[PDB]
Each structure stands twice: as C-alpha cells, then as structure tokens.
Design a protein around this nucleic acid. Structure first.
Lengths: 85, 94, 77, 92, 78, 82, 96, 93
DNA sequence: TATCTGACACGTGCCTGGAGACTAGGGAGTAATCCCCTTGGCGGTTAAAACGCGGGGGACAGCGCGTACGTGCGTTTAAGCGGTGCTAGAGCTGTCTACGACCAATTGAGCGGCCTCGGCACCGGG
DNA sequence: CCCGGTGCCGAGGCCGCTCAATTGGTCGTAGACAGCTCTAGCACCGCTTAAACGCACGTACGCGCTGTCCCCCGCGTTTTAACCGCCAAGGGGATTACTCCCTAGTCTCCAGGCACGTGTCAGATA
C-alpha cells in the first residue's frame, strides 16, 4: 500500500537501465547480428515496455479482484492477455 | 501572414506546406489549412489548460510530463482521445 | 540474460499497477510476457531500420514500431 | 535545420496561463502530440477526399474528419472554433 | 453455431437502427444492405462479447455469466 | 413516422441465442438489460460515424459502404459488403 | 506475352495494381517492380486462404466455398487468424 | 458502367489450387473485399515507409519491407519469398 | 430421387484498360568527406538486489441453504412474404467558373546563437 | 533538513541572419449546379405461422461460511553490479556532389476483361 502510493505518485523508471539494455541487445542479436542501439532508442523501449507492463498488471489486478482473490496469479494474466487480444 | 489573418497562433503556412508535402491529396483547399490549424490550436489549448490547472494544484509554475499525463487521464474526452497514448515519464494515476 | 529483470523490479512495477500480493509464478510469467512483447517491438524496429539500410536502431524506429502496435509513444521527437 | 511547433505551443501557453512555463521534455511531448493529431486528421481528411472521389482536401473535409476522430463535446468545440476561424479568414 | 443464419430478428433490428438514427439527424434513409451490414456487425460484436464474458465467468469459477462479467470484459478490452 | 423503445425488439430469446453461439451456458436475468445497453451504445457509436460520412457526401441514404467505413473507424473491419 | 502479369507468371493483374498505386496517391512515383511484388504477394495470400477454404469444403463435402468455410479457414489457421483476427465475415459464423 | 473487381482472378487462383471446386457469389465478394483490404494495407505501409525515408517513390524494396511488417512470421517469410521470386522472374524477360 | 435451374459455367461481342517506344529530367545510387556518438574498459560507492527465516493473512476446499434460471406447455404477437403501387433520391451527363497550382519577386518571422537572469533547486553554512 | 545565498541552468530576452511565407497574376479544371432517369426504397395490405411471452416448477448453482494449510511479506543481513565519470577511438550517420538510370508522360496500338447474351450441371428445387 505505502509502496503502491509512493510509486504511483512519481514517474521515475523502475527497471534498472543496464540490465534492460542488455536484454534488448540480446533479443536484437537474436534477430540480426551487430546492430547498434542509440541510448535514446533503448530509453524509448524502456518507457514503452514499462508502461505496457504496468497496464498489464493493472488489468491482472482487475481480473483477480473480480475472482474474489487478492493475489494475482498466472491465470489472471492469461485472462487479461486473452480478453484484451 | 495568414495565421494573423485568422488570429490563430499556429502557422497556417507551415500546416499548408505539410498538407502538400505529405501527399494527402492532389490539391489542397485554401481554407483547409486554416481550419486544421484552428483545430490544432484548440486541442493544444485544452491540453495546456488542463496541464496548467494540474500544475497549479501541484504548486508548480513549469509544466512537466507527469502533469500532461495527469491532465490527459483525468479529462474524460481527452482520455478517450489519447487512450492508446503513453507519455514519456508520464507516470500513472494515483 | 532475461533474468536481469529482478523480482523486486516486477514487484515495484505491480505496485505502480496497484497490485498488493503476488504469487511466485507471476515473476516467471511476467518475464516471459515482456520477452514476447519486446521480441515483437524490436522485430518491427529492426525491420524499419534495415529498410533504411542503417546499422543503428534509432528512437524514431522504435516509435514507429510501437505506432504499428497501436502504442503511440510521445516524447521522442 | 529542423522544424517543430514548440514556439507556437509556447505562445499558446502564454495565451492560456500567462504565468506558467514548460519543461523541454514536456515541450517534446507537446510537439509530438501536435504532430500526431495533425497527421491523424490529415490522413482522415485525405481518405474522406478519396472516398468520395474528390481531389481537393477542402475545409469541409477537415471538418468532417474532426467530427469523426474526436469525441462528442470536444468535437463540438473543435468544429466551433475551426469554422469561426475559417469565417474570419475569409472576412479579411 | 453449426449454421450462420442471422439470430436477431430483421425488422425489429431495423426499427432499432432507425430509432437510434432519429437522434442524430432526421429523415435519413438506409439501404437494406446498410441495415444488413449493421446487423452482421452487431451480431459478431455481441458474440465476441459473450465469448469474453464466458471466459471471465469461468475464471470466477462460476457458470452463470453476470453483468459484472460483461463489465470486466469491456474494461479489459481497454 | 415516429419510433419508440425499439430496443426491446431484442427479445430475451434473441440474446440467449446470441450467448449460446458465444458458448455461454447459464445466463443471469440481469444480463439481458446490460446486453441491450451495450448493443445500444455500440450502435450509437457506429451510426454516428456512418451518418457523418453520409452527411459529408451530401446524401440522404446511408449506404452499406458507409457502415463498412464507419466500422473500419472502430477498427472492426467488415468483409462481404464491397 | 505483352501483359506484365504474364511476364511475371502471375494470374493477378499487374497493370491494375500499378494503376491503383498511382491513382491511390500512395507516392509520387511507383517503382516498376513494385506492382509486380505486390501482385505476387496478393496472389500468394489468396492462394493460401483458398487452400484452406477448399480443404474445409472437402471436409464438408461441398464443391462450392461459402462464407462459413472462409470463416473456418481463417479462424483455424493461427497465422491468418492473427492477420484477420480483427475481421468479420458476412454470415461467417464462429468456430464451435 | 464498368466496375472493377478481382473476382475473375480469384476464380482463376481457385482453379489453380482446388480445380474441382466452385465458389458462391457471397464467398467471392468476401474474397474481393479481402484482397482490397490487404492491397490497401500494404500500399499504406509502403507509402509511410517512403515518407519516413524521405523517398518519393515506392520501389519493390518498400513493398518487401511492408510485407515483412504487416504479415506474421511464417506468412511474411513465404510471401517475401514468393514476391522476390516473381520480381526476379519478371525482370528476367 | 428427377429436374430444373439458375448458378455456375460458357461464347461472343465490344472496348477500354493495358502495353510498347521514345524522351527527358530529377530522383536515387555512389562516393567522398566530416565528426560525432557509440562502445568499451576501470575503479569507486553503495544502493540495489539476493538469501534466509518466521509467521500469519489469504487461497482453497468443503458444506449447507436458499433461489434464480432452465425447461416445458400453452397462449399470443408480430415477423416475414408477397405484392403492389408510388417517388425520392441516387447516379449519370452536361456545362461554367470560381478556386487552386506555378511561378516571380519581396519581406520579416523563425531559427539558431548570443547573452542574461532569477525559479527552482544547488550550494555551503545553521 | 533550512536557509540564505548560490547557481545554474533552464527559461527567457535579444540579435541578426533569411528563406520560407506572402503576394499577383495566369491558366487550367475540379468542382458546383442542373437536368434527366430509373431504380430502390417505402408504405401498406393481408395473411400465416413461426416465433415470443408468460406460468409454473424444481433443482442446479451462487453464495456465504468455516476451517485448514502454506506462500508471501517484512525484516534483517550479506553480496553484488548498477551507476558513474573518465577517456580512447573509431564506425557510421550526416552532408554533399555527381551520374545514370527509371519513370512520368506521351502517343499508338490492341486484346484480354467485362458485360451481356447463352448453355448446362451441383445443388436446390420438385
């Protein structure tokens, strides 16, 4: 609750930068070797991914609340992904 | 100018150069850029009104992304318009 | 690699998302989901880039890729 | 050499909230938002033109496109001010 | 399900469409094809809605869809 | 000629058949009114855009293509009508 | 063969595609090979979807394809379904 | 009043694939609308690519990249293969 | 199950979109250069994360009771067919002309640097 | 932290260079308007019967409750790499200039496409 209010109040990014950058680069390497990413583009992916993720958890929480539970579960995320399409 | 001719702050000429360049149609009507510039002026005016209100409520004289995010998400119509929109550093509604 | 998304990071994310209690499997599921989402966005961004015969993904590349996903991103020129 | 709407957004800011500033980061958001809305309306109007097989994007096209993209009351005010400006432009 | 024959009655649906239009601008006509297209779109949309509502109901370990389910589906559809 | 409350024209058996096609088995009574509301909202939205299209084209007759375009606005592309 | 489609060994009309591209104001100029490529893609996709439609009709022992079959094919194939998952088919029905 | 449609070509492709199989008028109409829809979507994407790269002409390259974007993985790959093959075949003559 | 049939398949006739040749120009391919951002590597701090433990709030199961929904039967309503008759409006063509495209010529608005200044936070003492 | 002064640095004003907006005029034609025409829609009328409405019933499901058991949360402690700032260099994005090559455009030529007229079998009709 306190953490919920604290984080929802601010707009600082949550995922540590360098790890996320390494993730993005790993995926890109999987697609096509020796690509380069501007720090700006990695930041853009950071923002988009974090916002998307946040929305996903919002929907998952809605589903869990609907199911009378309080603890989200993989089932909830499956449902949120499915309905939204 | 032309914007002056219409009292709009937005660049009629700029909008007109864009309508032509972006190949939206063979030709472009004379009043079309005027109308479109006025519309853009109105929409930005509404966004900025709400942002300034939020900043005042937040005790800040300089607007920042979070303020835009709040303004957009709070207003029903705008939120409907920008529902698919994610704002850099926007944060989320409390 | 993917596991760089620390459990606590997901906890913070969900907190911002309003969640209050989270099951253990949530972490792995979220990790996989985000992996898929990125895979998609980066595929599209890399394609945009390759078409421009460039070697460096650019912020605009990602912006368009998200635009295709119905994910308009503001604040990147 | 690059374009933007930043200065015009700033002028609007002074029009509406004389005593308020805006972060460059926020000006970027404002600029991209204007670009997005402009592009949406323009493409919408282009389709209106092609759809009825006319080669001219006249004010009428933009009016209907706005009436389509925006929600109800926002569309009402938008069309109001747009038509008003168009009239004035012809007046002078 | 096995078939595709329309499910909402034609004429009542037509009168519904006309009534709705009556609140936008009077004396508008509708090509029978337009009415058919609207009916097909509504049928598909409602079938999708009920599929989603059924998913939600199963999720809640219930069997009887309830308006709460519909609300949930509409909301998660963003 | 006037019109009235034709929303009820979507009779309970109609909605029940709809849900059946959707795989639902058991339906609460409260559903019927809610579904009637949702359908009304959906039609309001689509018809608003279709009528706008027609008005722009200086016509008095909503054509199937007009509804098709309106649906496309909603992002619900429709086939089989041109 | 004078017709470009024949030159490319495609049943679709290359010339029609080119005309549409120019007339549809997608760009000022249209590459010579662009209509060729696009027509090839369109023919491929139509052939693909019709493959599954015909197979479904065979399963239904029907010589003629009908919207029911097209709906079946689109919904059953994961890829097409993803491509056309946001679509509605006149009298399409839905998968059991 | 002449009116365009791909019904003839769709019918031809049907003969190619399921030669012993007919098609209803409604199904043909659906196919016609489907072809128009994808043609339009690919053309729009190619146009946006052109204008993104500040290039004034839609070449084969743009359509290729557009197909790679719109279509899903396996379909995209197969279509790209088919398209490049057809372009090569055409340029050969 | 004929049969018929009109829905698909088939011929023919027209013609209109498509194709080929030539031209010219500007648009795109190429290279050459400039220089910036990108990576990469290190060391230092330290906040961030990783791990363990304890308990307890919450998920899950089972049970019991009530009741709202599915089923059926009988009764009622209007949806559908046709059918028939009228015309408002779509569509198509023909005419005119007001409006937009090009371009030549001029001007100051906008762009970017330059400076400067205090609002909001840095900074250095309480 | 506070706290006044710093400062700084992002806002904000100013400067000047300018190149894109403005303006004029011309010419073309897209678009406006009118006239005709012919369907496609509307209504209305009667009829039929299929569908819908309502009643009654009972029972399967929702819902509340309990009661367990255990999976997360919070805390503490220990480990880590994320961030940092620097610096080095170098790959490529940006910019420009130049060439040739492709495509719009035209004329000109004609045959596949499409409509319309016609035959005939897969499936609907009988």
């Amino acid at each position: 609750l306190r953490e919920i209010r604290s984080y929802q109040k601010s707009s600082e990014l949550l995922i540590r930068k360098l790890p996320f950058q390494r993730l993005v680069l790993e995926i890109a390497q999987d697609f096509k070797t020796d690509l380069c990413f501007q720090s700006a583009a990695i930041g853009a992916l950071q923002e988009a991914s974090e916002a998307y993720l946040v929305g996903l958890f919002e929907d998952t929480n809605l589903c869990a609340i609907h199911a009378k539970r309080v603890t989200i579960m993989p089932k909830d995320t499956q449902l949120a992904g499915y309905i939204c399409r | 100018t032309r914007s002056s001719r219409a009292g709009l702050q937005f660049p009629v000429g700029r909008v007109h150069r864009l309508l032509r360049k972006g190949n939206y149609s063979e030709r472009v009507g004379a009043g079309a850029p005027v109308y479109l510039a006025a519309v853009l002026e109105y929409l930005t005016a509404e966004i900025l009104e709400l942002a300034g209100n939020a900043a005042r409520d937040n005790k800040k004289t300089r607007i920042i992304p979070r303020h835009l995010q709040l303004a957009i998400r709070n207003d029903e119509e705008l939120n409907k318009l920008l529902g698919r929109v994610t704002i850099a550093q926007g944060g989320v509604l409390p | 690699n993917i596991q760089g998304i620390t459990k606590p990071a997901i906890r913070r994310l969900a907190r911002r998302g309003g969640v209050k209690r989270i099951s253990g499997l949530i972490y792995e599921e979220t990790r996989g989901v985000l992996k898929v989402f990125l895979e998609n966005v980066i595929r599209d961004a890399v394609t945009y880039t390759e078409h421009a015969k460039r070697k460096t993904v650019t912020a605009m590349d990602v912006v368009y890729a998200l635009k295709r996903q119905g994910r308009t991103l503001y604040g990147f020129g | 050499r690059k374009e933007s709407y930043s200065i015009y957004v700033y002028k609007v800011l002074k029009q509406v909230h004389p005593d308020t500033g805006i972060s460059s980061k926020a000006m970027g958001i404002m600029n991209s938002f204007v670009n997005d809305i402009f592009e949406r309306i323009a493409s919408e109007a282009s389709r209106l033109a092609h759809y009825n097989k006319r080669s001219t994007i006249t004010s009428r096209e933009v009016q209907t496109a706005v009436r389509l993209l925006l929600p109800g009351e926002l569309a009402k005010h938008a069309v109001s001010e747009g038509t008003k400006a168009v009239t004035k432009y012809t007046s002078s």
